[PDB]
Design a protein around this ligand. Structure first.
Ligand code: CLA
Ligand code: CLA
Ligand code: CLA
Ligand code: CLA
Ligand code: CLA
Ligand code: CLA
Ligand code: CLA
Ligand code: CLA
Ligand code: LHG
Ligand code: PQN
Ligand code: SF4
Lengths: 167, 163, 741
């Protein structure tokens, strides 16, 4: 009865509460209750992969070709560019890496907290500037459009990686 | 939870430690004595505040009359260990630290000593009117700031002369 | 989910109150000392957890945390070794010129004139020459700097601290419940797939990315200063493509399945590297990668939480034939309800594995410049041989302990253990016969050769120029191994080891490794080895089987594992316990391993180790006197002990004088042990009575009454001192004989 695939039934665990849910869970991984994943880990991982993939797409576009902040020269697709930016300004790229690492450590503590109690929802960091949580409809629409356009980000980034890696 | 609003409400926190804001992601305090942690934090902060003051002082200023002080801060440790002043400061700080180790053990046993209580108020800047808690919040906060600032200063001076 | 994590929080309170009550663990010793025997007991029952609590959960939690403590100690030892390499060693000078510079990482303070022990090893350095092969190990890892050794030591110290904290935490804070321990399938999966699988995989990654390029540059003659740091080999791929032009392709061949493209650095050439004299690093990389794959595969064999997998209980219950009744029914309960059984198996396997390591490492030197370091090779071989023997005998002892304590006949009805116990008489009788046959024939060959040589009848001996006993089977196996490359191992360029046959690998005019020919002397010594091994097995197996009962004492089990006797009745009942069987087996293991080490040392000095000339002529250390002199006892006494003991006795006044002093001290301790071994407790008790009267006459009388050592303790002390003296004597002998070079 799954909306995505009528021939295989929708999982019992998926009730559609989470955004972007079309009952598309053939292997039924959401049912996992072992090794500590349990569909809250998967939701968090989806949101994180998708956000960082959107950033990756925007970065690879490189339309301005001013190297983001001034002082960053030259344009290259992926690997040579990463190495060259690291070479010219290791101080800034290391700073960005450590910013991401700090948010990651705090996020991991938060993941454990959300596991223990439902206070922290999946993909939630209270980073909303609009602070819009009174009425559900707008929050749900924004969240599900985020997930959709980030899934597109991930697929586009695969379209990028595939080129130049084959024989 | 204070500051970080999505963290799990730091346990055995607040109600003490004027400098606290509720930021304990790893939460070591839960499984270790809070008094020991407070003592460690305060001592690190004091030592590093003095370290920042010394590093800025050595920055082409206030050098002592001896010729060995034409040397800079980066090379100061080597010139001092060779000159032997470093060994002497080690001696005196070790004496103070042993006398304070007795106090740390007493504090842990339940002697009632406050973490950083060393009764050192020659000019008694503190007063009941001044509010010891207000005086300490600044102490702890500027100490943490100095900790981080000195770490940065030494690292980025090992990269290139900050000034 | 049958396999799950179960713990008890705050299992034990942390306090020093117990530290001031020695003997608290045992109920008998907690009452305080009445006599000095108490003292000894407190050090003898300290780690006998099974005798301190009747609950298996408590014993399991103690064992887990004691293992954590042992890991902390080992990490501290590694930290110390690495730190002494970084700060007190000539590792850099040895790196530059490995052949001439003698490894040394220990320095002695000049306090009484002991600074003579600071040898002139070289590299503008003075210290005690080390024989632990740590320099070769570090070079194989591409250290090339003392900063890396310093940080290795710091990491080891941090890991020791973490192990200590883990032990404390898992005893006093979060102690796993018994059900957690009794997961053999999950434990095996995790130890095979990750501990041994991913360990191999990670080490293979290190070798591919760090050790391989650095060692290739070193072999090319690049000075360590100009070798780029190991991290430089991870950022710019081209920098590695110059050495192995297969990285250029990257990881795409790996996933595409074209693994053949990696043959540049994943080879199967075998043999030995002519430059360094060790195994090719690419060969070891491919080896560890294959082992990682196999271990990861084998770690999925057992069923843990998802239906797929093997249930070892069913596996054992299924294997039963007509000759063995119920087959392996009840062994799973034995190995999941008694730590002594598991310890017996694990110690036996670890000991045999250590001996296999000792045999394999000398034949195929794995590290660069270790083959020509004759002092290191000998030390490593003898060390690991001794460790293996000790572990084997310990496995025997703990098997006996299991039999006495954890054996339950109700759960062992007509299974393998029951049947073995029921034809133990036949087993022991036949082992006795084979031991006597081996001893008679093998040792009588030596006695016959000695008698004939003394009578001038050299044509009647068992020698090459006389009645010949050629190890034809061993020679045939050697020939097959020689012919293997290209025929039975077509993708292997060279034989596994040059011992079987081939060229003479010499590095810097020193014979790193050469073929070893087997003659009649090899036949006789191998049969001597078999005889000694069979006798040791006889003693230990007899101790294990007759641990519970015998035709002398039908109720031996009630007497315990180790007890002195059962009185002078039935003739005499001395040393009837299984502990005494271990006590004798230790002597016989020491004897057998002494013979093994003498065989190895003399054979290598006389037939392998030596020097080469530019033409190719071979000159061995002792001139190949093994063939015609290793066939008589007098030959061993003269050409091996008397001849090779010159270095120790003449080491006074040189850096090796410490070895002579230890030689004498080991002789002294060995002789001292005989005082405990021969004498009995009654004499010493009466002598102590007289001495106590003398003390009392002056109003000096300890409240803790002195007591002569218990019978069991007397035997244990005698054996310990005997082993220490023998081991130290051979230690000094070998090290001084192989360091005067
Ligand atoms: C209050 C503390 C403090 C302050 C004011 C600074 C300020 C600064 N740091 Mg320092 N830094 C700090 C802590 C601090 N850091 C700490 C804790 C570390 C880690 C040990 C570093 C490690 C660091 C590095 C490695 C570098 C800087 C650099 C810089 C400069 C970069 C500024 C910018 O816009 O980019 C700036 C002057 C960079 C610079 O210009 O020098 C640089 O290369 N910092
Ligand atoms: C410093 C913190 C601390 C404190 C206060 C205690 C206190 C206690 N522990 Mg705990 N324990 C700790 C750390 C600590 N332990 C750590 C780090 C471990 C991991 C190894 C354990 C593992 C452990 C176990 C498994 C058990 C205890 C037990 C005990 C009790 C008796 C111990 C005793 O008197 O033996 C004092 C003994 C010594 C001081 C000798 C230790 C020798 C060390 C480890 C080796 C160093 C020598 C080495 C050979 C090098 C020289 C050569 C007591 C409540 C026992 C208990 O309560 O059961 C009733 C018990 O069964 N502890
Ligand atoms: C674990 C293996 C190990 C081993 C066997 C050694 C062995 C040695 N080291 Mg090395 N070392 C190690 C680890 C090791 N160290 C580690 C991990 C470090 C890093 C910190 C070092 C750092 C180091 C340095 C920096 C130096 C040595 C030196 C030495 C030598 C002299 C040590 C000595 O007697 O000084 C004197 C030591 C003592 C007198 C010991 C103190 C006595 C205590 C107080 C007794 C207390 C016992 C207590 C009562 C027991 C109950 C417990 C109680 C606390 C409750 C000796 C060959 C020295 C050397 O070689 O000089 C040329 C040297 O300079 N080592
Ligand atoms: C745990 C062991 C380990 C680790 C941490 C690494 C890590 C790395 N390898 Mg190595 N590698 C390993 C084992 C390992 N490898 C083994 C066993 C082989 C033999 C097949 C190789 C063969 C190999 C080659 C041929 C190359 C690497 C490269 C790399 C780097 C790029 C990783 C990448 O793009 O993969 C993507 C990550 C995943 C698929 C996950 C990275 C530093 C590349 C490199 O040096 O570039 C920097 C490269 O060209 N590796
Ligand atoms: C196939 C790749 C490979 C390569 C290149 C090596 C290379 C080496 N091995 Mg290793 N080894 C391997 C695989 C490999 N090994 C495997 C799979 C095992 C498991 C049995 C071992 C076990 C092993 C031991 C025990 C020892 C070595 C040693 C050595 C060195 C001896 C010199 C030599 O020429 O070795 C040639 C190596 C061989 C001729 C052994 C080949 C073994 C074959 C591949 C067994 C395959 C078993 C098969 C897959 C079973 C599957 C059953 C399963 C499906 C149920 C050398 C570095 C010695 C060493 O380093 O000592 C210092 C040593 O003592 N190897
Ligand atoms: C994994 C290794 C391992 C483990 C965990 C155990 C654990 C145990 N064994 Mg087993 N054992 C082992 C290996 C092991 N053993 C080996 C290899 C042997 C062969 C020798 C034995 C032989 C053996 C016997 C015969 C007996 C045990 C017993 C015991 C128990 C009590 C041990 C005790 O109180 O220690 C006390 C520890 C000491 C008193 C320290 C003495 C250490 C020696 C004598 C001195 C070391 C000298 C040193 C290395 C060099 C000195 C240099 C000099 C110059 C100073 C305990 C269950 C006893 C028992 O009843 O268990 C139920 C028992 O009767 N074991
Ligand atoms: C060098 C002294 C020595 C000798 C010769 C022996 C001999 C023997 N021991 Mg003993 N043992 C010794 C020291 C010695 N041990 C010590 C120091 C210990 C203390 C740990 C032990 C502890 C010990 C135990 C615990 C065990 C043995 C066992 C054995 C036997 C092994 C089987 C064997 O070889 O039979 C063959 C006999 C010999 C090789 C002896 C030499 C005979 C020669 C070859 C021929 C002699 C000439 C011929 C008889 C001429 C006859 C005519 C003549 C009478 C005129 C054998 C009786 C084991 C045993 O009896 O079970 C099998 C056993 O379990 N021994
Ligand atoms: C056990 C070791 C051993 C062995 C194998 C030999 C072997 C030999 N010795 Mg030596 N010898 C030894 C120990 C040994 N000796 C010792 C310890 C001494 C000191 C006392 C001597 C002193 C000595 C002297 C002084 C002389 C010899 C001589 C000899 C030779 C002739 C002996 C003879 O007449 O055979 C007699 C043989 C038999 C009676 C046959 C019985 C044995 C058979 C083969 C057993 C078969 C069992 C069978 C497999 C069971 C199957 C059952 C089946 C049906 C079901 C022979 C080569 C002589 C010589 O010059 O040699 C050239 C000589 O003059 N020996
Ligand atoms: C590896 C050992 C190889 C030799 C094994 C001998 C056949 C062993 C063999 O085939 O055993 C097989 C025999 C058959 O048992 P089942 O097949 O019924 O047992 C099923 C098993 O899964 C166990 O349940 O077991 C016994 O009878 C044990 C007592 C053996 C009595 C004979 C002992 C002879 C020992 C001396 C032989 C030494 C030969 C030289 C050794 C290098
Ligand atoms: C000598 C001897 C004694 C007497 C030995 C005694 C009482 C041992 C004395 C030990 C002293 C008091 C400790 C100090 C020893 C050394 C100075 C160093 C310590 C050695 C270890 C204990 C660490 C026995 O009781 C005995 C019993 C059964 C069989 C043989 C013998 C036996 O041979
Ligand atoms: S001599 Fe000693 S061991 Fe032998 S029976 Fe008498 S008391 Fe027991």
């Amino acid at each position: 009865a799954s909306k995505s695939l009528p021939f295989l039934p929708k999982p019992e665990k998926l009730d559609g509460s989470l955004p972007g849910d079309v009952g598309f869970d053939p292997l039924n991984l959401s049912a996992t209750d072992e090794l500590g994943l349990d569909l809250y880990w998967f939701r968090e991982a989806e949101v994180k992969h998708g956000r960082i993939a959107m950033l990756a797409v925007a970065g690879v576009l490189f339309c301005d070709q001013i190297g983001s902040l001034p002082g960053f020269p030259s344009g290259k697709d992926q690997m040579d560019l990463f190495w060259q930016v690291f070479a010219e300004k290791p101080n800034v790229v290391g700073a960005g890496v450590v910013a991401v690492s700090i948010l990651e450590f705090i996020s991991g503590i938060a993941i454990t907290a959300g596991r223990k109690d439902g206070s922290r929802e999946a993909g939630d960091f209270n980073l909303d500037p609009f602070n819009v949580r009174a009425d559900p409809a707008k929050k749900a629409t924004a969240q599900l459009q985020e997930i959709k356009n980030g899934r597109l980000a991930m697929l586009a980034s695969m379209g990028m990686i595939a080129q130049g890696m084959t024989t | 939870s204070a500051s970080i609003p999505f963290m799990p409400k730091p346990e055995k926190l607040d109600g003490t430690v004027p400098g606290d804001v509720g930021f304990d992601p790893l939460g070591f305090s839960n499984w270790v004595n809070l008094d020991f942690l407070r003592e460690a934090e305060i001592k690190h902060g004091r030592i590093c505040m003095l370290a920042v003051a010394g590093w800025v002082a050595v920055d082409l200023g206030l050098h002592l009359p001896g010729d060995v002080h034409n040397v800079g801060s980066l090379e100061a440790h080597d010139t001092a260990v060779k000159f032997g002043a470093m060994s002497q400061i080690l001696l005196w700080t070790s004496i103070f630290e042993a006398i304070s180790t007795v106090g740390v053990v007493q504090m842990l046993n339940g002697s009632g000593r406050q973490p950083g209580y060393f009764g050192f108020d020659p000019l008694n800047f503190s007063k009941d009117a001044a509010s010891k808690a207000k005086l300490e919040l600044n102490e702890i906060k500027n100490g943490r700031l100095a900790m981080l600032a000195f770490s940065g200063i030494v690292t980025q001076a090992a990269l290139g002369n900050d000034f | 989910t049958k396999v799950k994590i179960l713990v008890e929080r705050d299992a034990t309170a942390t306090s020093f109150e117990k530290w001031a009550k020695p003997g608290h663990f045992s109920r008998t010793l907690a009452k305080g000392p009445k006599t000095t025997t108490w003292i000894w007991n407190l050090h003898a029952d300290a780690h006998d957890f099974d005798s301190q609590t009747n609950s298996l959960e408590d014993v399991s939690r103690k064992i887990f945390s004691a293992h954590f403590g042992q890991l902390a100690v080992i990490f501290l030892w590694l930290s110390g070794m690495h730190f002494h390499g970084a700060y007190f060693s000539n590792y850099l000078a040895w790196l530059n010129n490995p052949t001439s510079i003698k490894p040394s990482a220990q320095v002695v303070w000049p306090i009484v004139g002991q600074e003579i022990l600071n040898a002139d090893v070289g590299g503008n350095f003075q210290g005690v020459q080390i024989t632990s092969g740590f320099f070769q190990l570090w070079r194989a890892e591409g250290i090339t700097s003392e900063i890396q050794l310093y940080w290795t030591a710091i990491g080891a110290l941090v890991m020791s601290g973490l192990m200590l904290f883990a032990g404390w935490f898992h005893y006093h804070k979060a102690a796993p419940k018994l059900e957690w321990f009794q997961n053999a399938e999950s434990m095996l999966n995790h130890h095979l797939s990750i501990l041994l699988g991913l360990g191999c995989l990670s080490w293979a990654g290190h070798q591919i990315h760090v050790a391989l390029p650095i060692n290739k540059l070193l072999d090319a003659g690049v000075a360590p200063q100009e070798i780029p740091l190991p991290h430089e080999f991870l950022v710019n791929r081209d920098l590695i493509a110059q050495l192995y032009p297969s990285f250029s392709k990257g990881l795409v061949p790996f996933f595409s399945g074209n693994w053949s493209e990696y043959s540049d650095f994943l080879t199967f050439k075998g043999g030995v590297n002519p430059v360094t004299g060790g195994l090719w690093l690419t060969d070891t990389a491919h080896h560890h990668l294959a082992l990682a794959v196999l271990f990861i595969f084998a770690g999925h064999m057992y069923r843990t939480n998802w239906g797929i997998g093997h249930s070892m209980k069913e596996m054992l219950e299924a294997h039963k034939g007509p000759f063995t009744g119920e087959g392996h029914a009840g062994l799973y309960e034995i190995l999941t309800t008694s730590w002594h059984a598991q310890l017996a198996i694990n110690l036996a396997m670890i000991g045999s594995l250590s001996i296999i390591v000792a045999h394999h490492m000398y034949a195929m030197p794995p590290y660069p410049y270790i083959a020509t370091d004759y002092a290191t090779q000998l030390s490593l071989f003898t060390h690991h041989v001794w460790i293996g023997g000790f572990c084997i005998v310990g496995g025997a002892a703990h098997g006996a302990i299991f039999m006495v304590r954890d054996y339950n006949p109700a759960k062992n009805y007509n299974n393998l253990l029951d049947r073995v116990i029921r034809h133990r008489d036949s087993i022991i009788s036949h082992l006795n016969w084979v031991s006597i046959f081996l001893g008679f024939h093998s040792f009588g060959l030596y006695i016959h050769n000695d008698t004939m040589r003394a009578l001038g009848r050299s044509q009647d001996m068992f020698s090459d120029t006389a009645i010949q006993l050629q190890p034809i089977f061993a020679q045939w196996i050697q020939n097959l191994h020689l012919l293997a490359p290209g025929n039975t191992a077509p993708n292997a360029l060279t034989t596994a080891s040059y011992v079987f046959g081939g060229d003479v690998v010499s590095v810097g005019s020193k014979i790193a490794i050469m073929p070893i020919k087997l003659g009649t002397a090899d036949f006789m010594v191998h049969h001597i080895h078999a005889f000694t091994i069979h006798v040791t097995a006889l003693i230990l197996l007899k101790g294990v089987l007759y641990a519970r009962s015998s035709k002398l004492i039908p109720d031996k089990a009630n007497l315990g594992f180790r007890f002195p006797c059962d009185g002078p009745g039935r003739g005499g009942t001395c040393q009837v316990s299984a502990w005494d069987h271990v006590f004798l087996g230790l002597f016989w293991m020491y004897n057998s391993l002494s013979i093994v080490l003498f065989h190895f040392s003399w054979k290598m000095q006389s037939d392998v180790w030596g020097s080469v000339t530019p033409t190719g002529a071979v000159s061995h250390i002792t001139g190949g006197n093994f063939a015609q002199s290793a066939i008589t006892i007098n030959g061993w006494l003269r050409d091996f002990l008397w001849s090779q003991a010159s270095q120790v006795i003449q080491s006074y006044g040189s850096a090796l004088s410490a070895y002579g002093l230890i030689f004498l001290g080991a002789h002294f301790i060995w002789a001292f042990s005989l005082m405990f071994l021969f004498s009995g407790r009654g004499y010493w008790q009466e002598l102590i009575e007289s001495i106590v009267w003398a003390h009392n006459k002056i109003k000096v009388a300890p409240a803790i009454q002195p007591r002569a050592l218990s019978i069991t303790q007397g035997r244990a002390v005698g054996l310990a001192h005997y082993l220490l003296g023998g081991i130290g004597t051979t230690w000094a002998f070998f090290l001084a004989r192989i360091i005067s070079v």
